[PDB]
């Protein structure tokens, strides 16, 4: 009943307060930050620019890359007054963008679900990654991972007829043979930062304050490089998620 919104808050009632009624509440857990975000969701896909026997090289094709950034937020070959520089590794973008004329598909990669619904300012967690084959041919593929901020080491094949990506002390994966088609695994919160920005970082990324405003540095879970004969759908999963400082969700269009 009667109250005062001015003070920053109000009585949070149930039927029994103003009327001859009562609390109808039942136990229920499924609405918890952790449990809720703890399910798999696609953010993009990987397409090999080259064989399992050669030297790897950044490669784009119809918005598809042979390498991808592990973050919920939007990403893509770095943008430029003259167009996204496709000869390079993807980076975090500040907005979502149509692949072409019509809205879909998207040029950018990201967790659309998480974007349309991230009721919070900061978050953190571990990331469980799943890489599933889109094709039906006996697979021969190599996958390389690296933590946020690490050298891409996108150098030349040392050993002929073998995959350059496999040539590293970093965590790499080798998948090959009939029936062997999906890669699954989990990586640690590997960022230099204490917590990550769910949406926006109200500051410059460089000391000169001239560049990339709104994007926090190393605000991601590292990245993936692929090589071999198979393209794959890539999904992420929020492990032991934690969120802070509540904020507004993505706007929804009012009915005409």
């Amino acid at each position: 009943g009667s109250d005062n919104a001015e003070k920053g808050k109000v009585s949070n009632d149930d039927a029994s307060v103003d009327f001859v009624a009562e609390p109808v509440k039942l136990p229920e857990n499924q609405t918890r930050v952790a449990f809720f975000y703890d399910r798999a969701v696609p953010i993009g896909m990987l397409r090999p620019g080259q064989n399992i026997e050669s030297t790897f090289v950044y490669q784009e094709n119809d918005l598809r890359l042979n390498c991808l950034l592990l973050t919920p937020l939007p990403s893509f070959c770095p943008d430029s007054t003259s167009g996204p520089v496709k000869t390079k590794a993807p980076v975090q973008w500040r907005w979502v963008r149509s692949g072409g004329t019509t809205n879909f598909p998207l040029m950018t990669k990201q967790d659309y679900a998480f974007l349309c619904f991230s009721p919070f300012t900061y978050y953190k967690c571990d990331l469980e990654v799943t890489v599933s084959a889109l094709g039906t041919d006996t697979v021969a593929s190599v996958l390389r991972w690296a933590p946020t901020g690490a050298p891409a080491d996108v150098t030349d094949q040392l050993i002929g007829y073998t995959p350059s990506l496999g040539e590293t002390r970093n965590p790499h994966m080798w998948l090959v043979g009939a029936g062997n088609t999906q890669i699954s695994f989990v990586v640690p919160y590997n960022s230099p930062l204490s917590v990550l920005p769910a949406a926006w970082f109200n500051g410059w990324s460089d000391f000169g304050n001239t560049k990339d405003f709104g994007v926090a540095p190393n605000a991601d879970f590292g990245r993936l490089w692929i090589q071999g004969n198979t393209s794959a759908s890539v999904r992420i999963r929020y492990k032991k998620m934690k969120v802070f400082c509540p904020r507004p969700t993505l706007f929804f269009p009012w009915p005409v």
Partner: peptide, 25 residues
Amino acid sequence: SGNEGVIINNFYSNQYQNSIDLSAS
């Protein structure tokens, strides 16, 4: 707390399965 419901849920040691939580101060 999260979406995990398996009993035999150890196999890999805890410290390997998850980032290690530690408090600066």
